[PDB]
Every structure is written in structure tokens, then in C-alpha cells.
């Protein structure tokens, strides 16, 4: 629990931000049939033309006789409804009061994507960042239904916070005009919560390595804990040795930071129904070992990210800890340690010894998220859950198949799949199914160990896959391969991926 | 004096510093060229051209007092010689008085200006030969044309290409005496001991950078510069890990951490007698070793087998304390900085991506942990403005994209202040050890401005990376005149395989002239 | 005059837009206590706070409107900030009751905007012009420019708000509106009215180059770039010539007809002159460099970051003098004859293309060891360099996307200038001053010379890393006793940000051509 040092200046803890701007936002939402009221800061309309690039036209009724002049068609029509194009203008309404007034083109489409809503977000958060403003109204001129308005929602207040706890006026109001108001208003809350766990993930991930060791990192779940009334337990390296785990135990040999093992537990008040083991790969810093991360485009300093898995589950955490689903029992594991070269680290060529007995032979260090993944889904596997799922930034070959948009999940189970597939429609985060091709198998059969780590045969992610399979003896598991899809590299930020689809994967 | 760590009890605990050179034993003897030449004794070689005619024969012009030399020198003979710059000959015979001396000469070409280069290039045909003599005596007759900066240049020069370091080894003799005949001797007979001086300091400083990393490390390099401080009668204080916490030192603690060695703060100091009227702060960028961290140099050409040059800059900066604690000038107070220490991979290393605490507050995010020069500068810079001084100027290895710009005779200079800028280019001048201005593009700045940090440490596309490291450096020095001098294409000499020992001779002409 | 066909749907001209919408822009000066008038379109202010960083707008003008100064009353604009280039947009009615656009832009509290800190407020102005549909936009301007900034505004206005869309056919912007009407405010208003034209026709010199360098390689090519300085030639009424291979094969032209051997187009040697009508006192040879494509030879640009799709602007120094020419030929100066030179051929890869290892012989009787096929510049800029010394001219200005080591000592902004002259340096980085064309400075280092030095040719093409340093010293070598200077603007060529050409030079060349 006590940080360890090599100087008196560096860091012993991860600064967390709990009480954020967002949270002081009041939130309304009216219905859009009696009219719009535009009495003070920014009105905006969410406008499509369902044409390519056609001009903007403003359908709802709005109760100001000045701000109607403005949205009449004649003026408007001098915009497009490009998607993300935006144009407002200050004025005086009826009251003589400042006001600004806009839109943010919807495209031709009459129903979004979660992408092009997001970019959609992007540009009504620019003009938040843009203007000091009390309040922002968003009218809904467009077909949105009940989890991608909350998306929109989550996304909005994602885009808009600011992280600035290594630096050295928000909005105070929400409006939301659309139709059926009445059936929207239940993802308000929903969404607030959503958004924090994705930006306490957000946090945990762009926190760097110096800050967010497997020390600080297990240290921030068990306040998390606390806060939750989560019970919860931390394995040392005296425990980790006793449980035989060699695997994930060789490769935080060469950290200066012991090895950490993070269980949190959530168990519902009634009778649990269903028992779910959620893993998260939890390298605070990957340097890929004697296998250094030097090849031209490794990208060694983006490598804080390599614990993206464990963020997801933990703020995956905060959200049932939080919203307290029923008849379910949930257990929040993360393997964390870090992978560095030492005089006492790891060799490429080594043989270790997993927690099932199985003996591995060691190719490449810097594939060592699957190392310490297979003896947590070992210790999943022992709790005798009903589902076990894995999320981690396992192999840089998602960038050349799916790329930074889709995560990939693989499986031994199509029952868990659908379900996680589901999941990835209703709360956004876009997951799209690959297969664990068998054929591969073989490429895994080590001349002097039981099994080979890595592959002779490319496709990375499947052998990955096939990999872990073999931890899973007799359970339905998961695992979705975040590698590519986990840091936004336009924005220079992570995306707190996969905290909203491991949410409504427990909920729904 | 720390206890210098080690591995096994094969490690050396210190770095073998020669401080009486043969060079210094050699009596220097400047004669008027237009009263003739003595050549009884010794190797005479004179420095020939011919204006005009492209390696043109030689022809020599001076009389001298020695009939069978006479008859040598006669241009039925020299004729079959040409002044190909460079070019030599030089052949042994007996004088009037059956001595057996050596007569010859050295091609200067046919422009009547001598570079640095052009000169530089005769000196070692010179000393060439002084590598195969064995006389006691060499003799110098400049029949070509040179100032009094030139001149002490061609004896620095001679100085230190003739004496060779053989403090890690386990022919010829050197000269006792130096001849020279040249025009107007009586001016330039008070240009030979202020070589002899120049030459020291860049000789020590090449000691320190020739010498291994396993030898010359941040605390075996802070003891030396102690030694040399009192020997010079300079202050001096020794800054210990302790204390550069107590200052926050983040930054330059941070390179430091993944190295088996403390980090060690040089400061120097030289106060002149009278009145102070100028302060002068001199930074010198002192990394024992640099592997590149966690971005380890791997890449082909990446030369990491020459990483214990990192700290020429330093190395620059303790010659020129010996210069000018030698020289000892009037009316200035001089401060010599160096933040030392070694960039090494470990259990301990600080990482690609750690966001570090610099001493003035500004908070960095490290995005490559090669680029650590800049880092430890940064706290020395703070450091240095913090001592009130007038002029801060900084000397470094700092930016291999100097190979790609200047190259490898000329450093580049950037700055805040023009007038400094001017003072180091006019050093250059009269040092003759050659520099450029090169811009601090501002236009540049905003690919330094980070995401989560106050500051990126290096950009991600823009390159041209020397101007974005200056405008790094920029950022933690708040309202002094400030220059940097980036040498990492110029400290090292490939064909000679050894250091240059540059910026010693510049920085010293900077605060004499000052 | 011919451009060869692989098919027949191979283009055979470089389409090229004379008529752009900009030269249909009406643009009227007037002076700023005259009192500004707001009827129509849009109306943008350029204000700031002198030491108030972020400070507020504050709006110090006249307005001959009661609505509009009502709205603009410092009231109402305390809520915004000066930050440089951030702008807003204001909606209201004037006097005679009409709907009007009003706006500002900030521009920080420096009391002077450098060349990038009102490139930068133009970008904010664009914006604002982009996606939006004005009859007429007015700018008024509460801060201080010179004569020169002012141009340069103007410049730079016309260049980023011109689209080019010669290579769009089914993806045209069915929404690109140009404004009809500008209009100016700015105080001491009849000094600055004489920099409008001036301006428009440093906009199309710029843009001219601009089209030359974006049209690709199937477009652009030696054969096509040269019938259209024939016809530019044409336009401007200057003399012009074209020399073919037989005319280079007798002025023994080795360095530059070997580089175009493994092409299917055959080298063409654009010569443009113009002569003042009176005495002569300065005679001048704009040279640059014109390959039209540079695939880098059998040492093809393969490795990894040599951009070889980008290598269509390797004829950016050539444009840059075609879009010279066209500023002079239109400005007509005085006391001057201008010579616009470009040796313009194809690197390629073929059975005829020249080798590594070949020696070849330059038109000054020098043979030449080729050490790299993609070094290719400096070997047709050698035979244009003595092509024009032969001319007798007092200056010879070099242009060229030379060497890409340009981006690791000076990067995307500053050219660099070289030369074997004081004076000619000192002019030329005077007319990047008032061109506002930044340049650099660099040596010509003679220590690495030797370097070339060959033992079987006269010189080597390649030292075997200080490349920009080492290409000057071999163009050195072809001019014998005349002022020259070389300009390297490998870096400096395209905008990545924007991903298109900027048309740098031109209007540095001609600054350098009048305040000759
Ligand atoms: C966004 N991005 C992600 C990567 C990335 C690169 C490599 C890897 C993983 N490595 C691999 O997949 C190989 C098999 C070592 C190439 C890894 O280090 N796992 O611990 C995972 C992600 C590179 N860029
Ligand atoms: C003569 N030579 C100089 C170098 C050299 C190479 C790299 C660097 C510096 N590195 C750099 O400039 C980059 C940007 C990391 C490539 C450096 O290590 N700074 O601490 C400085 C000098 C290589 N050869
Ligand atoms: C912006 N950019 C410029 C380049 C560029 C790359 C290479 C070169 C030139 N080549 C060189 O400078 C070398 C010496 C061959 C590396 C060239 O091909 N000249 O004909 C010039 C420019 C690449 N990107
Ligand atoms: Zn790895
Ligand atoms: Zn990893
Ligand atoms: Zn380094
Ligand atoms: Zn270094
Ligand atoms: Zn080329
Ligand atoms: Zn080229």
C-alpha cells in the first residue's frame, strides 16, 4: 500500500477528480410541442436535411418573436446541414437580453451512427469551449431513441470536462427540447453515471506510468471501494506466490513495483441469480520487455495505456456500484504490474509456470498481457462464476483489422457473444465478433513446453485468443480486444472504452 | 570528493587527468621574418603558396644562413614541388657546420586567406611529420600572410593535434623548441602563451570526453572539476541528490533516476578582484552516458558507441574555467553550471509518457527519453537565472538534426537576445572555432503544448527539431539574455576518431572580450 | 508543343482557372473616420487589447448606425475577448429596420502582428466565409498595419478563400458562394488603396504557381508545363522561348538532358524574358528547378517517409518563376530585364533512365559522377545556371525544392538562402521582409568541398550529411563570376495542414525584382 520511491519527488499517489463541473449541471427536459423557450445563453438546433449538404431549416415553434425572425428559412437557408458543420449568433430577444443562437448540422441521414452523433457532440462542445455560458439548449430536430439520446448525453458530458490534474466557467444548466420528453427523462441520471465511470477510467488511463504504478492504481480501487461499500482484497506477491500464479508473477519481475492483484466484488441484496467475473489487463506501463518496444511506430510512449482493461472494469465498477443491479454477484478483477527491463527481468526464451500447471514458453515479452491474463482468468475460473470476460489492450494487428473505431471480442461460447454483441448496440461502444480459428491451434504446440505464448503464422489476435483459451477449462468467457481502439489519437486522449458496454452487459 | 560507486572491484573510481603536457615544456621563439632565417638546428619546415597559379611550384623567399641549405632552397630544386594545399616534402641533409638537420616545406595553395579549415589542414601536415621527428627543435617560417587571431590559432592548433592522449594505452620525440619566423614578431609574441593556455583548456576538455563512460561518470566528472577548482582557486560546490530534491530539481532528477551513479550539481564560480560590472552564467549540457532510456538507441546509425561525448558541453565548460581561471579577467563574475548525470535503462528508469515536475513549477510530459539533454538543462537554466547573472549562455550536445543542417564544422546558436547572439558570433570570429545563427521559429511553439502537462518535452510531427528544442529551453529562462550553443554535430572529430574539445576557445574569448 | 499519349484518356493540358472567382471581387477603401456603414452582408471587426492578454473587445470605431453601436456598445462586448483568433458572430437591425451580420476577430494584445499572427486572423476570417452565403463582407481594421501587412492581408484573404476545384467532376461544393463586394476601413486609407491591385495581382501570381504545382504529374508535365508559359508568355506580351532536345543536344546540356533520358516526355527549357521599355540598369535570372515529377530514379524514393506521392510539387522553384513572370509582366517595372528560366524534365524509371555510377558531361565542359539518381535537381539546375550566366545577367536567383534535409534545420516555415554574394543575400532576405516570404540565412560551408571530389570525373553530384550545404557547393561550381543566390524551399513548398501547395517564392522574387 506504501509507494515505493526512487526519489523524495516522485509521486505516491494518483490524483482523482469525484466531484466534477458536470455534476453541478441541472438538467431538464421539456417536450417539444408547446414551443421553444430562448431566454438566455446558447440554443441549439440539431438539424438534418433528409438534401446531401442541404441548407439548414428550423422546424419547432419558438416563443420569441426576435429569435424567430432569425430561424425563419430565408436566413437559415444561407447554412448547410453539412454533418458537424455549426454557425451561432449573439442577439437580443424579445426581453433585450443577450442570447445565442445556432445549430450543428445532422448530415442527410435519418438515423445517426454513434460516430456521427459524436461528431456531432464535438462540435456543439466547441462552441461550450468557445462561450461562457450558464446554460446550453439543445433542441432535438432529429430522430434519436432512448440509448443514443443518452449516448448523446454521456458523449456531451465526456467531451466537455477537461482533465487538468497535471496542469500547474461550465455551464450550470441543460435544456433539452424533444419530442416524448416524458419517455427521455430517465436517461438523464442514467447518463450522468455512465460518465463518470468513463471519466474516472479516462483519468486512471492518461494518468502516466510514474503516477499510476501497480501500487497507486490498487490503492485508487480500494477507495473506490470504499466509496461504494464494494467489499474488497488485494494480493501481494507473498499470496500471488502461494497461489502459484508464475505466469503473471514473470512479468513484473523487473518492476521496481511489487505485483498487485485487484478484486472487488459487488453482490446484490436479494438472491444472486447470476455470477459474473469481469477481468481487466492492468500493465500500468508496457516497455515490452527484453523485447523492447524500438521498432518504428511501437509507440513506447503511449504505453500508460496498457491498463486500459483494468480502467474499463474498475469504472465498470463505479457504474454498478452505483445504479445496484439485482440477483447478480460481480467480481472486478485486474492482474496489475509492469513490464520493464531489469537485471531482473523475464527472458525471451523462458519457460514459466501458470497458475493450472501449464507451462509456457516465453517468445516475446512484450507479449505480456496474455501472460498475466491467463493466470486471473484461472482465479476467474475458481470463483465458479457463470460468465467470464476479459477487456484489455491485447495485440497492435486490431489497428490493421478493425481499426480504431470497432473492438474485437472473441469467445468460447455464442450465448456470451449475442449477449455482449447486445450490449455493444445499447450503450454505443462498437464491438463487432471474430472468430477463433482452430486451425491455428497447432501453431501454439511448444517443443519443450506444453504451450507456446506466442505463434511460428500472423493474425495475432486469434492466436491471442486461442491462447487464452486454453485457461478457460469449463466456463463461458469472453474477451474483447481493445488494442486499437482504446486511445483517441485526434483528440490525444483515451476514450474510457468499454466501462458503458461492460455496464449494460451486467444491467441489461 | 564522493566515493564513486561500483559493480566489481575492477571499476575505476576516478578519471586520469594529465595537467603537465609535453606541449608545455616546449620554449616558444618568435623571430622577424626580414632579418633572415638561422637553420643550424633542428626540422625547418617552411609554409609556402603561390597566388594565381593552381598548385603551382614552390618557391621560397627567405635568406638564410646556411649555404648548403641555400643551395637546397634554390628554385632550380623547389620547382619540382607544387603548394597543393596540404602537400608536403621535407628532406634531411647536413648544414654548413655537418649538423644533420631537416629542411621542407607545407603547401598552402593559392589564395592569400587562409581559412580555419585551410590552416587547420597545414597544421596537420605539420604535425605529420612531427609524429616521425625526432629533432629537438621545429622551425616555422610563414611566408604566406596571417593576423594575430590566425597565428594563435595555427599554435593552438599545432598544440593540440601534436600531443596525443594515451592515458587508457599500457616513433618520435617531442620538440623542446618551437622557431618561428614570421612578419612583425613583436606583435604576435604576446599571442603564444595565451595559446599555450587555450590550448590546455581544450586539451582537458578532451580529456573529459575521450574518457569512458566507465571512467568518467557524474561522480568521478564532479571530483575532477573539484580538483580543478582548487587548483585554480575558484569556489566551488558540489550539489547532492539531498539538496537537488530540496530545490525540486524534477526535471533533472528524473534522467538521473534509472543511472547506478548519484546525480551531482557542478557549480564553479569566478570572482574577479575589483569591481564586478558583468555576471555570466555558463550552462554546459553533462550526460556521462547516454543510451537513450527506455528509447534506447537502436536505430541504424543511432551510434551509441559514442554517447560518452554527451557531456562535451560540459567538458567545454570546465575548460573554459580553466582558461579563465588562468587568464584571470577583470571586473566579471563568472558562474560554471553543469547538471551531470547518466541516461540508463533500469528497474528505476523514468518512463516515456511520466509527466516531471521541472524547479520553476512548469510540469513536462516526457515523450521520448532520449531527448533527456533538454530536461536536465531545464533545471539548470532555472538555476542559473536564479543567480542574477547578465548573460546566461548554454552549450550542448543537444539535437543530432545539427548533422543534417550545419553539419560538422559549424555549431549552431540560438536566443532570446540579439545583442548576445552578436557577442557569441563576434567570439566565433576571434576564436575562430566557427558557429552560425539559426532561428527560433515561434510559429513552431504550439506543438510543444500538451495535452495534460503544462509542456511538451519534444513535438510530434514538427521537425526540425533543434529550433523546438530551443524553444523548449526557452521556456525556463523568464527575463535574461540567453543563448544556446548546440554542438552535437560539431564535438566529435570522425576522421580523427577523438574529441574536438569545441566551445572551450569560444566561450573564454565570450567573457574576455565581454 | 505535341504532349505525348499512353492512352487516350491521358490529359494533354494542365487545366489552368485565369478568370478566378476572386477577380470578380469589387473592392472598396475607405477611411475609418469617415464612419463605417452597416447595410449588408457581413461586417468584422479586427480589434485587440494592447497588454490585456484575453482582454475585451472594445469596439473604438465610428458606426453611422444608433442600432448597431447600441449593440456595439461596450456593454454588451465585455463578454468577449480579444485572444487571437477567436471570433463571433452578432445578428441584428439596423436604422432602416434590415436584418444585418456584424462580427469581430481577435488579435491578441501585441501592439504589431507578425506574418503568422495575421495569417492566422485571416484563417478566423475565412471561416466565417466558409459554409455561409454573403452577398459582401467588410473588414475594418482597428488595428495598426503597415503599407506591407496590409498587402499581405489582402494577399493571403484572396488565396485561402479561393477553392480549387479543376480535378472535382461528381464532389464539386454545390454550396462555394463568393461574396461580390469588399470593403475596407482603415485609417489614412489612400496610402493603402494603391496595395489593393497590387495584392490581387500578387494573389494570382501565387495561386498561379499554386495550380501548377497541385495539378499532378499526368497533368503536369514537361511537355504541358512548358506550352503553358508559352502561353502565360502570350497573355503578358513577353518574348518567349522553348528550347528542345536538339537545341540542348548543341549546347551540350549533358547534366539536364541525362536526368529527362528515362522519361516519355522530352526536356523542355522554358526561357521567358522581360525587357523595360528604356534603359537597362539591372539584368536578372530568376532560375527554378522544374521536374515534374521525381520518382527519384533506379535510387527510387522507396524507403520509407520519402513521400513519393507528394513529389508532384518538385516543380514548386519552376512555378514560383512562371508565377514571377506573371507578377512582372503585369506590374511592368522599370530599368530591369528579367530572364525566367526552368529546366523542365521527368525522373524516372526505365531502360533509358540514367544510372548511378554514370559520368556525364554539364554544358561548361565539367563531367560529373552521378552517386545518387534522386539528387537530380542539382544536375539540371547546373546546365540552367550556366545557361544563364551566358546570359550576361547581374544576378542570377536560384529556386528550388532541392533537399529534403531542409526540414530538419528550418522545417516547414523558413526557407533557406544560400549564395556566393553579400549584397544579393542582404537583397534577398530585404524582399522576404516585405514580401513576408520568411527566409533563412544559411552558410556555404567550403570545408566539405572536398567531399566532392571524384577520381575519375571533375566533381561528384553527392558527398559520401549536411545535404542543403553540399548541393549549394556543387551549384557553386557552375557559376564562375557572377552573384548568385539559392534558394531552398524543399520544406517550405507544401502546406501538410491544409494539404495544399502554399506558392511560396513568387512573391518574394518579385518584391526582389522591384525594390531592385
Ligand atoms: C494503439 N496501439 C496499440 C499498440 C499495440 C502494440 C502492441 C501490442 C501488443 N503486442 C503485440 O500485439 C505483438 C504481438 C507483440 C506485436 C502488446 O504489447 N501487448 O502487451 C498492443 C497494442 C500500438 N498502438
Ligand atoms: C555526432 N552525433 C550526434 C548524435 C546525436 C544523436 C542524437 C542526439 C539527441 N537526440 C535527438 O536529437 C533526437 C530528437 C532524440 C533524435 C540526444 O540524444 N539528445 O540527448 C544528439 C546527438 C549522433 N551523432
Ligand atoms: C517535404 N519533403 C521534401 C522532401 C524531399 C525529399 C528528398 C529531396 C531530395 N533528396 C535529398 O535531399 C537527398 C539528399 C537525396 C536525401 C530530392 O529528391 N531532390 O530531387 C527533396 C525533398 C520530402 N518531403
Ligand atoms: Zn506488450
Ligand atoms: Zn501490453
Ligand atoms: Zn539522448
Ligand atoms: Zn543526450
Ligand atoms: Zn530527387
Ligand atoms: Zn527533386
Known amino acids: 500500500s506504501e509507494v515505493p520511491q526512487v526519489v523524495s519527488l516522485d509521486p505516491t499517489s494518483i490524483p482523482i477528480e469525484y466531484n466534477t463541473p458536470i455534476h453541478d449541471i441541472k438538467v431538464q427536459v421539456y417536450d417539444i410541442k408547446g414551443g421553444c423557450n430562448v431566454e438566455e445563453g446558447l440554443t441549439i438546433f440539431l438539424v438534418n436535411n433528409p438534401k446531401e449538404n442541404g441548407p439548414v431549416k428550423i422546424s419547432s415553434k419558438v416563443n420569441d418573436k426576435q429569435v424567430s425572425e432569425f430561424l425563419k428559412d430565408e436566413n437559415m437557408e444561407k447554412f448547410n446541414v453539412k454533418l458537424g458543420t455549426s454557425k451561432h449568433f449573439y442577439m437580443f430577444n424579445d426581453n433585450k437580453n443577450s442570447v445565442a443562437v445556432g445549430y450543428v448540422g445532422c448530415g442527410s441521414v435519418a438515423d445517426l451512427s454513434e460516430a456521427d452523433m459524436k461528431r456531432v457532440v464535438l462540435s456543439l462542445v466547441t462552441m461550450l469551449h468557445d462561450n461562457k455560458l450558464s446554460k446550453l439548449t439543445v433542441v432535438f430536430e432529429i430522430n434519436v431513441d432512448k440509448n443514443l439520446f443518452r449516448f448523446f448525453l454521456e458523449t456531451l458530458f465526456y467531451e466537455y470536462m477537461t482533465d487538468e490534474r497535471f496542469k500547474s466557467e461550465y455551464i450550470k444548466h441543460l435544456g433539452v427540447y424533444i419530442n416524448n420528453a416524458d419517455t427521455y427523462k ?13 471519466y474516472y477510467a479516462s483519468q486512471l488511463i492518461a ?7 501497480p501500487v497507486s492504481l490498487s490503492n485508487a480501487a480500494v477507495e473506490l471501494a470504499q466509496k461504494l461499500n464494494l467489499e474488497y482484497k488485494i494480493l501481494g506477491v507473498k499470496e500471488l506466490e502461494e497461489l502459484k500464479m508464475g505466469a ?35 500493465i500500468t506501463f508496457d516497455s515490452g520487455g527484453y523485447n523492447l518496444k524500438a521498432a518504428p511506430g511501437s509507440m513506447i510512449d503511449l504505453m500508460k495505456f496498457d491498463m486500459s482493461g ?33 537485471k531482473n527481468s523475464y527472458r525471451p526464451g523462458d519457460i514459466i509456470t501458470a497458475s493450472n500447471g501449464k507451462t509456457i514458453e516465453v517468445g516475446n515479452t512484450d507479449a505480456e498481457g496474455r501472460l498475466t491474463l491467463a493466470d486471473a482468468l484461472v482465479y476467474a475460473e475458481k470463483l465458479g462464476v457463470d460468465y467470464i470476460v476479459d477487456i484489455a489492450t491485447l495485440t497492435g494487428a486490431m489497428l490493421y483489422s478493425l481499426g480504431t473505431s470497432y473492438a474485437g471480442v472473441f469467445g468460447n461460447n455464442e450465448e456470451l457473444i449475442n449477449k455482449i454483441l447486445q450490449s455493444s448496440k445499447t450503450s454505443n461502444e462498437p464491438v463487432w465478433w471474430l472468430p477463433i480459428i482452430n486451425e491455428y491451434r497447432a501453431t501454439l504446440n511448444s517443443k519443450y513446453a506444453d504451450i507456446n505464448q506466442i505463434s511460428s503464422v500472423k493474425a495475432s489476435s486469434i492466436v491471442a485468443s486461442l491462447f487464452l483459451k486454453e485457461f478457460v477449462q469449463n466456463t463461458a468467457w469472453a474477451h474483447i480486444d481493445i488494442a ?13 472504452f468499454g466501462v458503458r458496454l461492460l455496464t449494460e452487459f451486467v444491467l441489461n
Not at 271 to 276: F, L, N, S, T
Not at 484 to 496: C, E, I
Open 484 to 496: 486499437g481502439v482504446s486511445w483517441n489519437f485526434k483528440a490525444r486522449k483515451p476514450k474510457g
Open 207 to 213: 494518468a502516466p506510468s510514474n503516477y499510476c504504478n
Open 248 to 282: 503473471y508473477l514473470s512479468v513484473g519481475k523487473g518492476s521496481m513495483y511489487p505485483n498487485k492483484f485487484i478484486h472487488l466484488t459487488y453482490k446484490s441484496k436479494g438472491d444472486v441469480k447470476k455470477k459474473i467475473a469481469l477481468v481487466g489487463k492492468g
Open 310 to 342: 483494468c480502467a474499463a472494469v474498475l469504472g465498470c465498477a463505479y457504474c454498478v456500484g452505483t445504479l445496484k443491479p439485482e440477483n447478480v454477484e460481480i467480481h472486478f478483477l485486474s492482474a496489475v504490474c509492469e513490464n520493464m527491463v531489469s
Open 186 to 198: 430517465e436517461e438523464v441520471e442514467k447518463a450522468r453515471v455512465y460518465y463518470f465511470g468513463t
